[PDB]
Amino acid sequence: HQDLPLGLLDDIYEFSKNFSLRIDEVEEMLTNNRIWRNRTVDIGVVTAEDALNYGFSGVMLRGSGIQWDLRKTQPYDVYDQVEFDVPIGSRGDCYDRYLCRVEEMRQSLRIIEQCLNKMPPGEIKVDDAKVSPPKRAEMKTSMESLIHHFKLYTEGYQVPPGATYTAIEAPKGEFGVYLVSDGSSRPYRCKIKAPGFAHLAGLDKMSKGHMLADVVAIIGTQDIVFGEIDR
Amino acid sequence: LGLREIRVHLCQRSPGSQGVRDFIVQRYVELKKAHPNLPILIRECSEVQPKLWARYAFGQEKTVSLNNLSADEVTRAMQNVLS
Amino acid sequence: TVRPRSDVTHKQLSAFGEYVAEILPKYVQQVQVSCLDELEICIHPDGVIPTLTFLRDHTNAQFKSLADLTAVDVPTRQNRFEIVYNLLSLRFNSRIRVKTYADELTPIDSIVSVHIAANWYEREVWDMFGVFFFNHPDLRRILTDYGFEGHPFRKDFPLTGYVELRYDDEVKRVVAEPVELAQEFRKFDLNSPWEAFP
Amino acid sequence: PATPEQYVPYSTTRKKIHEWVPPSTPY
Amino acid sequence: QLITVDEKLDITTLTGVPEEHIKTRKVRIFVPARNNMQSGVNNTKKWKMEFDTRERWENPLMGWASTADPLSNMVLTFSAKEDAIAFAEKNGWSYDVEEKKVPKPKSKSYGANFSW
Amino acid sequence: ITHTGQVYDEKDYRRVRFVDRQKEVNENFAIDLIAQQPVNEVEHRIIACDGGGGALGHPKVYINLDKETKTGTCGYCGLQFKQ
Amino acid sequence: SNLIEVFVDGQSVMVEPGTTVLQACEKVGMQIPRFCYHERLSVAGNCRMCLVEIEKAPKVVAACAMPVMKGWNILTNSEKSKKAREGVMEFLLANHPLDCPICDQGGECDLQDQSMMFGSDRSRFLEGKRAVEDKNIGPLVKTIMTRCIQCTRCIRFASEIAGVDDLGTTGRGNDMQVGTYIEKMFMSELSGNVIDICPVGALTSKPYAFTARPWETRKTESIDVMDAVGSNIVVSTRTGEVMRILPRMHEDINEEWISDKTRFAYDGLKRQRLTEPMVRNEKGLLTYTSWEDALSRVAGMLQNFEGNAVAAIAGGLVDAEALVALKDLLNKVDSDNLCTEEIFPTEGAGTDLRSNYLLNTTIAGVEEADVVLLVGTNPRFEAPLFNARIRKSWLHNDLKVALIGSPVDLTYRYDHLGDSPKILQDIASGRHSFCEVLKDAKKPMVVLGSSALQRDDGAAILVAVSNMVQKIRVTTGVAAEWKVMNILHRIASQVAALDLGYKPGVEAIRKNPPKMLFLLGADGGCITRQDLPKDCFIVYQGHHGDVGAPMADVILPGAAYTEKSATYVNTEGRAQQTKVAVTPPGLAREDWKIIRALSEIAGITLPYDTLDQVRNRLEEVSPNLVRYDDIEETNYFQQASELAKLVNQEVLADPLVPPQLTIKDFYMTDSISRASQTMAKCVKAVT
Amino acid sequence: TSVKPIFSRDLNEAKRRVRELYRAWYREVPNTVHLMQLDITVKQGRDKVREMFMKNAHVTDPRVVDLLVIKGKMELQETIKVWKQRTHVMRFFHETETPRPKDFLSKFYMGHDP
Ligand code: SF4
Ligand code: SF4
Ligand code: FES
Ligand SMILES: [Zn+2]
């Protein structure tokens, strides 16, 4: 919606510069502890084919060793220009899934590092006024911009009729919107695929032969937040 | 008890109405003269067999279906009502 | 402001669409690669388990994961609901859409056998739109209230429902109540009357 | 570089209707 | 298979609509008319099925408009008289179809206004 | 009474609201503050009115102060301009 | 088959010779972006925003004025016809003042859309804009004309639909301003249409200045009740109060236009409005009380009084559904003294054969007539959108209009035969000159405005006209389905009343005074307490307290046509349905139910209990009330004449004069109008 | 005209299901009152069941009766289990809702809506 403020990229560097120590500080606290490994290792193992069949599609998919990120398989935006390593894992167990989540935080610092180093000078919104609203100075000095601001805010983009399923790798897993669109300014259907509706279904299969305490770990390792599941 | 009005609902163009239409062209002009100020509201049917309604003293009404009823018959039917 | 696209895909996928149409002539009614470079094989409702099994288990088309199952409701069409299944091939890095049509009173089969992902999505389609899935283990309301009457995402269901809840001291329970809204929802008739040149 | 002053809403609308006031003296 | 039935497919009992909103309520299939204020004819091409207008009253506290008609903001959009009558009969509502009113062809000529 | 009336009639039960309370009412009526402003004299037939700002004021409209009979008033600021 | 074949981007449609390029695109379904071209207004070519490119042709042509020729393929979405719109829209916008958040034609702009769909993303006009000087064209039209795109629609409408050529262009160059040279208000009926027809928001409505914005307005399609043309209209309601009434197109009745009265008297609908059921109390003051108490005040008197002691003077805007509920009630106590305020001569077949009392030729027949002899009316101010009909058919076709009334402003060139009812006899004798003119007419029509019939010799005036129609028909040998005799009304609830069997005129109540009268929306002075039995029990059934309210023992508030699903019928019998735009106010209730309920308290309960049931009732009394938007033709005229011949009456020498002599006469004519602040402002502007 | 059967072919065949649900519900009402500590009496509730199974007693399209059973059975499952709390089950009794009058004079006397 608006350009980055004049000091944001310096402040993101200072956070990313020191964040890595904060990760392994948690790293030393939980990775080698007897107590954490026993609570997490070999709990909720999901086999590779079962993970694909249950539609897990996330770190749950990669934790079992399947190679799929959606940022390197079907790139979106400019991820095709940033370099990172997917952290896949074996022995699909909560621990391997934890270790993968800690690695992606580290790999994301590598991607954030590239974005600050290589962000291009330019404008932040496509500027065909039919899709993105006209700039504040332009709408207050040129008539074509006032008309385009009035219509865009009051009525809308009026996207051409069609339907699309676009999936991006959301932190939980594949988040996809199936937007069906009539020519109208307001959508007709918007099916939010939630990485989480599939994961919670897996709870019964993943948490089998497990005690009450294991179930608390099983929900924790699906990173399920009920907004996405309930929608 | 006492006739107050007679509404002849006749389709405009159908075999059934046929003849009913004749009554009007042959006797309405006279009926109105004969027993004047007898509200006779001739009105239009809609693919519904011609009918003759008739209010009486206290909200009372009678129907007589005259679908395919011939001219002379109608004539009398009107005369029967204004007995 | 014009998408950077690859024509390779349109062609490659179009070719698969003809492949699937040739391999399954009995159930596929229309196959089309949209200009968004995505594929859609439209199948007769009876082809729901045959078409999806071929895609889940064929060497030249492995479509292991069910991304989602959803049902657009176009009230005009005789068969209103248009169940749509979006599937992903990890092996070939491509995605497909198989969409079939189901009416209020004609159920379609359940793919829980083909993909166990659908056990939940099919329950949500029943709860939201009322389509019934044949021989589906445990079909029952996923999202709506335990006593909810009516299928909510149907286009013929009022945004705000017919019942609301409140706590009534006299009965000490959360009682339902016909919906009275303090500010009706202004429905804006915002839609231009000058159509866009295609 | 308990309080009585509590916001209370209105209907700042000028009442949008006018009823016939019945005739003052009888006929 | 292929059982035969003779109903107008009344799904009134599968819909879930409270009786009083399926009984005393009249849908009005019609093709919306043009906004005289504009000359665009793109909003007069698809048949709509809107319901009856019930009480729109005033919230005593803020003066907003309140309502108890759950089916008030409902304007289903069809593509032909046939498909709208079908839906209304399907759901058990009463209908009041209104035939379309396309402008007839009016002959226009530039020179005509130059005759004398 | 607010700049737009709203004053409750003594009988109105809608007055309880303010009991043990009071009424949020702005004392600075814009009907008068704008009248407490000097008519902006100008030389040109037409004048602009960006709202005393570029992008921090109101859309820029040109007013025709062509008749001394009337001081043009930008529909946005209510500022009268004296030719 | 003179179709000629022409290609719309290939669809290869076939069209009549002489259809414009824009028209050719319409039948394929494409829309040429257009300004300054209105279907019922002459082509002008001012904007040239419609430039298209016929194929293998050198330049772009104006789709509004180019007759399509043989085998020209129109390319409406070419790379050229878009630079021919991307570059025009550059110009219209360049001199435009950006006050779109002032322009109340915000979402109702045919210039932002076309900019927002066919125009340009940016601006290149880095120069100074122009400004024009706001003038006063009246109290109904707010001309913020710095908005004007000089599209000359206004000038044409003002000159081709309304015959008032007051508007015009003045000056050349970029300061051509389309406003009256001297400041003379645009005073005419049909005036408000300019608002609807100016696509720009330069001149818009002053009452509806800034009360709303169109996306919010919920639009319910209903029927005009102010005048008897029954013009179709759309009532735009926001959060439950009507904000504006604008025309919706009916080819036959109002083709996109509505009267000044039925567009600015929506304000009158919101004050002096009855809401709670008061009942005379104490010294005689009316006191608000609950329905139960007010209804049994009336019911008890009704049970006490027998037939012919109970009468109803209905009149004005009451719907057909109430009219049958009031007749069914008073017959269940056997008084058939139900009557209407407008006296239609019943000294003949009277109300009995609709041919008698209905414009027989439909409004749309005025287009095919050949000579029209208007006698007794100022169509202009009685039925304006029928005056327009004779306006269009005198311009585009060749109607020879003749008036036997007062010489009056008719917006067209009429022949004033005279101001005397007896000269009607002159034409019947063949003595007057226009007798041959008609002889020369192959399709003639005669119009007698009820406003004449309302005089004392109205029975004689109808009989005299019927004699002349008879020999006009014989001499012309006009075909049977062509119908010469028709009479136009000026009260919405007259035709329906007459159809339902209500007998016109309060003459019957005059001869025997009823102990109890249930005035049903009657604000006329046809009877008064002064002219009633000493008991004088009378109960007003209506919406606005005007004349019947202060002389009323009971007040049973009703609704208005914006507030009920009632039926009305205009003059050629086309029944039409008003839809509920806003729920009725206060304890006020629908007219039909008040009477069904009073009957239940009385004990003579009426049969119907839901409105579909009352519609079924109407089907029994008059069957072409249950049928909407249909005009039925059975000209039972010949027998009408026979009874006219039996009737002998004298047409007095007094000239027949329309009550609405000039437009101040027109503005305020009904409860919903006499209560209009906008109409009142209009009245003082004239005076 | 022809229509695929949802689960039953002839209305009679289906009714077999409708009865196999009535019985189930009837034999359950007693349990619910006790389990969900509801206050209404067994008899009272069993009345409601018949009412409902009766409300739908006019459809003849087997497919519809094949469908209402299912919905019907589902409602048992929840009620048989205690997936539904007291609030849910007690909602079938419009305890707070004031039953709307039907007499015309009773409606005319209140509310402009019919
Ligand atoms: S007309 Fe009014 S709305 Fe349309 S553009 Fe000019 S200003 Fe904006
Ligand atoms: S006023 Fe409206 S109509 Fe008359 S010219 Fe200016 S824009 Fe065209
Ligand atoms: S629209 Fe064709 S000339 Fe203006
Ligand atoms: Zn300003």
3-state secondary structure labels for all residues of G345-410: CCCCCHHHECCCCCCCCCHHHCCCCCEEEEECCCHHHHCHHHHHHHHHHHHCCCCEEEEECCCCCC
Closest CA to H68 of G80, C105, A138, E43: C105
Fold of A1-231: Cytochrome-c3 Hydrogenase; chain B (1.10.645)
What is the four-CA torsion angle of G524, G528, G532, G534, rounded to 10 degrees?
140
Cα gap G680→G674, rounded to integer Å: 8
Alpha-carbon distance of G39 to G41, in angstroms, equals 6
Q: How far is C-alpha A195 from the geometric centre of its chain's CA atoms?
A: 9
In a mutational test of the D interface, the residue from G272, G538, G541, G547 whose CB has the highest number of chain D CBs within 10 Å is: G272
Chains that touch E (3 or more CB pairs under 8 A): C, D, G, H
Helix and strand numbers (H, E) in chain B are 3, 4
Q: Are G352 and B48 in contact (CB < 8 Å)?
A: no
d(CA F73, CA B26): 77
Q: Is C177–H84 a contact, with Cβ atoms under 8 angstroms apart?
A: no
* Residue A94 annotated as binding site: yes
Give residues with Cβ within 8 angstroms of A7, minimum separation 6.
none
CB-nearest partner of E66 from C78, C104, C183: C183
Find which of G122, G129, G200 to mutate to test the A interface (most A CBs within 10 Å of its CB).
G122
* Ligand 1 site residues, Cβ closer than 6 angstroms: A 147; G 96, 99-100, 103, 105-106, 109, 111-112, 147, 200-201
Output F73-77 pairs: Cβ under 8 A, ≥24 positions apart: F74/F49, F75/G99, F75/G102, F75/G144, F76/F49, F76/F51, F76/G99, F76/G102, F77/F34, F77/F49, F77/F51, F77/F52
The domain limits of chain B are: 1-83
Q: Where does ligand 3 bind, in terms of residues with CB under 6 Å?
A: G 34-37, 45-50, 62-64
* Nearest-Cα residue of chain F relative to residue D12: F6
**Amino acid code (one letter) for A162:** G
Q: Contacts by G561-565 with C-beta closer than 8 Å and gap 24+? A: G561/G222, G561/G223, G561/G225, G561/G317, G561/G319, G562/G222, G562/G235, G562/G237, G562/G242, G562/G266, G562/G269, G563/G588, G563/G590, G564/G319, G564/G590, G564/G591, G565/E52, G565/G611
Instruction: Check pocket membership of G141 for ligand 2, CB cut-off 6 A.
Output: no
- Stated as kind and residue range, the H or E segment containing G423 is helix G423-429
User: Which residues in C lie closer than 8 A to residue H64 (C-beta atoms)?
Assistant: 105
Q: Which long-range contacts (CB under 8 A, 24 or more apart) does F25-30 make?
A: F25/F1, F26/F2, F29/F3, F30/F3, F30/F78
Q: Which ligand is nearest to the CA of G159?
A: 2
Q: Which CATH superfamily is domain B1-83 in?
A: Glutaredoxin (3.40.30.10)
| Tokens encoding E94 | 């009463």
The structure tokens 């020369």 sit at: G440
Pocket test for ligand 2, best of G109, G151, G156, G193 (most atoms within 8 A of CB): G151
Catalogue the E-assigned strands of G63-110. Answer: 73-75
Of E73, F15, G147, G349, the C-alpha closest to C155 is E73
Distance from CA of E56 to the nearest CA of D (A): 14
- The Cα of H102 is separated from the nearest Cα of chain G by a number of Å equal to 11
Taking CB atoms and an 8 Å limit, are C190 and A185 in contact across chains?
Answer: yes
**Parallel/antiparallel/unpaired status of strands G338-340 and G310-314:** parallel
Q: Retrieve residue C109's tokens.
A: 């089969």
Comparing CA positions, the residue from G54, G55, G126, G114 lying closest to residue G87 is G114
Nearest in space to C192 (alpha carbons), one of H32, E39, G314, G556: E39
Its sign, for the CA torsion G485, G490, G493, G498, is negative
Which protein residue has the closest C-alpha to ligand 3 atom 3?
Answer: G45
Under 8 Å between Cβ of G630 and B10: no
Chain A residues touching G120 at Cβ < 8 A:
144
State in Å: Cα F60 to ligand 4 middle. Answer: 7
Residue G496's SS3 state is helix
Q: How far apart, in Å, are the Cα atoms of C96 and each of B25, C54, C67? A: 75, 13, 10
Count of pairs with CB atoms under 8 A, one residue in E, one in H: 48
CA Rg, chain G, in Å? Answer: 28
* Secondary structure (3-state) at G574: coil
Q: In this complex, which of G99, G132, G133 lies closest to F75 when CB atoms are compared?
A: G99
Q: Cβ–Cβ contacts within 10 Å for residue G70, how many?
A: 8
State how far the Cα of G63 lies from the Cα of G239, in Å rounded to an integer: 42
DSSP secondary structure letters along H5-16: -SS-SSHHHHHH
Mutate which of G98, G102, G103, G210 for ligand 1? The one with the most ligand atoms within 8 Å of its CB, which is: G103
| Alpha-helical regions (H) of G265-350 | 291-304, 320-331
Helix (H, G, I), strand (E, B) or coil at G326: helix
Contacts of G491 (CB under 8 A, 6+ apart): G228, G315, G316, G340, G341, G342, G450
Dist. CA A13–CA A2, nearest whole Å = 20
Radius of gyration of chain B (CA): 12
- Cα end-to-end distance, chain E, whole Å: 77
Residue at token pair 């101001």: G419
Burial label for G113, CB within 10 Å (0-12, 13-18, 19+), is buried
| Shortest Cα distance, chain F CAs vs residue D27, angstroms | 28
With CB atoms and an 8 Å threshold, state whether H104 touches G596. yes
What distance in Å separates the CA atoms of residue A177 and residue B16, rounded to the nearest whole number?
64
Please state, in angstroms and rounded to a whole number, the distance separating the CA atoms of residues G604 and G607. 9
G216 contacts G238 by C-beta, under 8 angstroms: yes
Distance CA B40, CA G346 (A): 12
**Which token pair is E91?**
């759901």
Portion 24-53 of G in contact with E at CB < 8 A: 31, 34, 38-40, 42-43, 45
Residues 6+ apart with CB under 8 A from H13: H62
The Cα G475–Cα G353 span in angstroms is 24
Burial class (CB in 10 A: 0-12, 13-18, 19+), E79: middle
Environment class of G405 (CB within 10 Å of its CB; exposed 0-12, middle 13-18, buried 19+): buried
Say if CB C191 and CB A155 are below 8 A apart. yes
C-alpha span between G130 and G655 (Å, rounded): 56
Q: In a 10 Å sphere around its CB, with 0-12 CB exposed, 13-18 middle and 19+ buried, how is residue F70 labelled?
A: middle
Q: Tell whether ligand 2 has an atom less than 6 A from the beta carbon of residue G137.
A: no
What is the C-alpha separation between G422 and G404, in angstroms, rounded?
10
- Coil, strand or helix at H62: helix
User: Encoding tokens for residue E33?
Assistant: 């008319």
First to last CA, chain C: 17
Mutate to test the pocket of ligand 2, among G146, G153, G205 (most ligand atoms within 8 A of CB): G153
- Cα of G507 vs centre of ligand 3, distance in Å, is 58
CA of G103, closest CA in chain F: separation in Å?
10
Token digits for A209?
A: 């032969």
From CA C165, how far away is CA D6, in angstroms rounded?
29
C-alpha distances (whole Å) from G558 to each of G182, G264, G527, G555 are 47, 22, 21, 9
Binary contact (G105, E37; C-beta < 8 A): yes
Q: Which residues of F touch G128 (CB under 8 A)?
A: 46, 62
Whole-number Å distance between alpha carbons of G44 and G46: 5
Strand, coil or helix: A187: coil
- Cα C47 off chain centre by: 16
Length of chain C, in residues: 198
Ligand 3 centroid distance, CA of A139 (Å): 28
Pair G100, E25: CB distance under 8 Å: no
* Residue G153 Cβ < 6 Å to ligand 2: yes
d(CA G127, CA G94): 9
Instruction: Judge whether A18 is closer than 8 Å to chain G, CB to CB.
Output: no
> Neighbouring chains of F at 3+ CB pairs within 8 Å?
A, D, G
